[model samples]
Target chain A: FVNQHLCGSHLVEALYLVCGERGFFYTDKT
Target chain B: GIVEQCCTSICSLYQLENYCN
Candidate 1:
């Protein structure tokens, strides 16, 4: 369970980076 | 109207005065 939570957190962080202003590769806005 | 609105509103890129879906 703890490992799953950690993985989930990592996934959210990864997604934020991918969809954030700093990482706009797959985003719709700049 | 809703379907068309959603379909045409989904943008993937934004430039100065242009966008891409």
Candidate 2:
């Protein structure tokens, strides 16, 4: 994960956070 | 390593990611 994170492409890292299918993990923090 | 980007839904804004899943 660190390797990809250091690659300078957030989109790639974002894909790694995939949560199952069509389902998205939503949260509102303040 | 620090507080950033607010606490809003990062996943919510990137709708396409969900779709691509």
Candidate 3:
């Protein structure tokens, strides 16, 4: 299994495939 | 994607985040 992506990780390009780019967000508001 | 959710909606997917290839 290649594995999924996490919030605190470096972030991989593959993540964009499953979740899409817009779905991702940052918690800078906090 | 660079502008995607921080974590996966699926736990199995999250496991990958914990341990990836």
Better of 1 and 2 by DockQ: 2
Error of 3 at B13 (Å): 2.7
Q: Can you give the lDDT of residue A8 in candidate 2?
A: 24
Clashing pairs in 1: none
Give the winner by TM-score.
1
| Candidate 2 lDDT, B1-21, residue by residue in tens | 101231222434355354343
TM-score of chain A, all candidates: 0.54, 0.30, 0.23
| Winning model by DockQ | 2
Cα displacement (angstroms), candidate 2, residue A21, comes to 9.2
CA lDDT of each prediction against the hidden true structure? 0.35, 0.39, 0.39
- Tens-place lDDT digits, model 2, residues A1-30: 464334325543454465444453333344
> How far is B11's C-alpha from truth in model 2 (Å)?
7.4
Ranking by DockQ: 2, 3, 1
TM-score of candidate 3 against the unseen true structure: 0.22
TM-score of 2: 0.25
TM-score (chain B only), all candidates: 0.25, 0.20, 0.20
Task: Kindly report which residue stretches of model 1 are placed more than 4 angstroms away from their true locations once superposed.
Answer: A21-30, B1-21
